[PDB]
Amino acid sequence: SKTYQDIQNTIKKAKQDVIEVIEKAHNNELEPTPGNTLRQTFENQVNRI
Amino acid sequence: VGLVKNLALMAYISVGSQPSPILEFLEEWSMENLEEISPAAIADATKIFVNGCWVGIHKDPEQLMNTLRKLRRQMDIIVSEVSMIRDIREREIRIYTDAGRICRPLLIVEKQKLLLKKRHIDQLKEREYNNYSWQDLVASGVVEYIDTLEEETVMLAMTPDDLQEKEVAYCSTYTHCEI
Amino acid sequence: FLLGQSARDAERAKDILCRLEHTTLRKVTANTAIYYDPNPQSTVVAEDQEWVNVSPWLLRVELDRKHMTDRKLTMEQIAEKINAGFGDDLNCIFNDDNAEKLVLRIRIMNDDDVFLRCIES
Amino acid sequence: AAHVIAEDVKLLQFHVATMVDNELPGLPRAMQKSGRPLKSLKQRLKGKEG
Amino acid sequence: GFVGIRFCQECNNMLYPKEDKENRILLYACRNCDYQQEADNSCIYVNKITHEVDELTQIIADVSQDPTLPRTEDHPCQKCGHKEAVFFQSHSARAEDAMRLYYVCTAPHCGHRWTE
Amino acid sequence: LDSFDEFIQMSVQRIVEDAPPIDLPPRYLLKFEQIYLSKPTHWEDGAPSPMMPNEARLRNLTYSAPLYVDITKTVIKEGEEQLQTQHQKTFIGKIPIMLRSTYCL
Amino acid sequence: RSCLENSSRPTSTIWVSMLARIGQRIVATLPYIKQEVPIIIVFRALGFVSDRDILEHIIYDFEDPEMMEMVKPSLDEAFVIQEQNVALNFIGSRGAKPGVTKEKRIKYAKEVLQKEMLPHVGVSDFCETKKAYFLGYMVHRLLLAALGRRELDDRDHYGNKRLDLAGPLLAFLFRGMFKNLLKEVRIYAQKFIDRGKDFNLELAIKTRIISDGLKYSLATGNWGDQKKAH
Amino acid sequence: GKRIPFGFKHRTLPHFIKDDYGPESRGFVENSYLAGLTPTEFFFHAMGGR
Ligand SMILES: [Zn+2]
Ligand SMILES: [Zn+2]
């Protein structure tokens, strides 16, 4: 029940991190990684988060 | 594995009906028939497709989809199995009446409310004591048989309260709700 | 595996990468517009370049820049491969590497209409 | 009849060859008049379970 | 730019480009007919290797009545000034590398679309 | 059950009302129409009696029902003399019935 | 896969494909034709001699030159066929049984363009103006998938699948079993009018065609006849 | 190897909205087996487990 709180906070920070990656890509600021398209650098940042 | 499957509990496989009262209705709305059309008038007009047959052109597809849907929700010309799909992005209305299309019933949601109100629950609790049944819920225009090619343009809520309440918005344009 | 000093710096390893990957014209080209400009000084277009260099049909080919640099190519080598691949049956009239648009011009010289399409594919 | 002999041997060939190979490419398989093709000598030892 | 098919006037067939080898001009003659009409584009075939497409040309305005398509109120229209707008990504195959959004005004008789 | 009932009620009267009339020397017409079906019966040294599915299951019978159609023969020839010697209810075959359908006992 | 409604004719599939690569030629793989025929030949066989008129069936907006230059390559291809009649001779020259006279070949290529390809749009005497629209729609939808303006269809989507329950499963049998007994009452009218006697049908109706074909396929599970059960 | 794919048109189920790349809309199950899985992620967990 403290662990539950620690987990819910980690998960909410993560859902929040992927929202900003989505904003960045929606406004064209997610610059592609050199070796990948845009939809692959996006999906990589998301799967990393 | 994966090739042999099973129906879900409330799946209904549609048994098939004749497309002739639809063809006859659509004719006497404002359709325009395919053989008396100038090929220059298909550009800005949605193409109507009954059972795979491109029979017609229509200049206003927000009145057909709302009339066709009112007319299934009463069980009168369109039987309840028929499915009208409106693709917005390409201008196409497809109507299927044929058989073998698997479908399932969904509650209907008008603005953000359901149509299933406490009357129906009470009348339905007193079934088998008189004679109120599922066919009155379908005929009264409360549930609907939506199927898989038409399910791609519903905006479906999973539980009714909790997805049709008021927060930061997820969609606020739900059109169906799951039982 | 890179050999000498190329193995350390990413800059001198990058031109190896350019000297090995397959670049055709399609990767650097942007727009191919054949034209029947009869009088080569007439140039149905705004280009004052031919008028310094001097068949009635051409291939104005406008190249790309961020694709031409990321492989580091100049128009001299494209112009040279462009006549070495087809010999002296053609006469490319390249732009300069100061202008903003990267235009080539081909002309045949020596069923004639489709031929610039046949060699541009 | 010096013309029917040709058909007689064509059908003899079909029978003697589908005795030792029932699967031919582009040739009617010899079936039994129950409707099932035969098990030639090549099939008795062809694949798994030969 | 482009070239269109320009059709014959007699047989309504497709006119080919043909260079006039005497007066030094570009014509369009037919195959079935003997119809020569005089060109004006002096451009025959064009080819976009970049395949540069603008999506705002493909957006129909009828998308705004799509129940299944997200709605914002933070980008207002520019012609009318409505608050509601739908938005979607290119929604196209051959999307090169872009997750760019497109907006449509959710107000009838407007259908103004824009990109930010 | 709905699929079978729709086969029995429409699709059989559709398969048989659209098969073309056969002819063949003078030649005839021989037209099929209007099919009917009965309930599963057994001896239809015996007497026709309804088979109950459990009796059909225990004697290894086949719970089926027999089909009848009404065929009008028109054989027509010289002298313009045709007769529609129509054969009512002509046996066609036996059609097996799905249990607890609209046509099961 | 075009099909009408449980007709004694089965399903019959067109293919309006486009070649890989001049480049970009559209062909058509009609049924009962062994080779493939470029499409403008079909639109002329259906009877549209002009070139603008084929194109108004294919391209609804003549204002985007994007789709115009995609069908030029196939529009140049068949400039050698211009009237309807040489057009039928092109398709009619390809059948499974190509007719030895020309007129046999045009009677073929007129019969396959009215009953074999695209029946669901109609198999009547005059339906070419709506088989033309539905063909031009198939070409148009191919050109949208090639211009990349529309996503390709997924074979796994359940909207693209129908289930055959115990109804159509059996009406597929009862058509073949009802054609076999009209082949039996045929031979039995035959062996009997040729004696010049008169023929009776009570003995011509072989009852063991239905009663046993059904009972056979429902017993083994093989959905066919017993003579072709493998 | 990818996230749950867009099986309907531009969305993974009909509950979500077109073009939703978020974590819940593409398969990220965020419950545990002790709390149980939400209905959509029961389905995505089954697509994965297949
Ligand atoms: Zn002409
Ligand atoms: Zn607006």
Swiss-Prot record, chain E:
GO MF term list: DNA-directed RNA polymerase activity; nucleic acid binding; zinc ion binding
Chain segments annotated as coiled-coil in the UniProt record: none
Highest rank taxon of the organism: Eukaryota
Span of zinc fingers (C4-type): 8-33
Location in or out of the cell: Nucleus, Nucleolus
UniProt subunit comment: Component of the RNA polymerase II (Pol II) complex consisting of 12 subunits.
PANTHER family for the chain: DNA-DIRECTED RNA POLYMERASE (PTHR11239), DNA-DIRECTED RNA POLYMERASE II SUBUNIT RPB9 (PTHR11239:SF1)
Entry protein name: DNA-directed RNA polymerase II subunit RPB9
Species: Sus scrofa
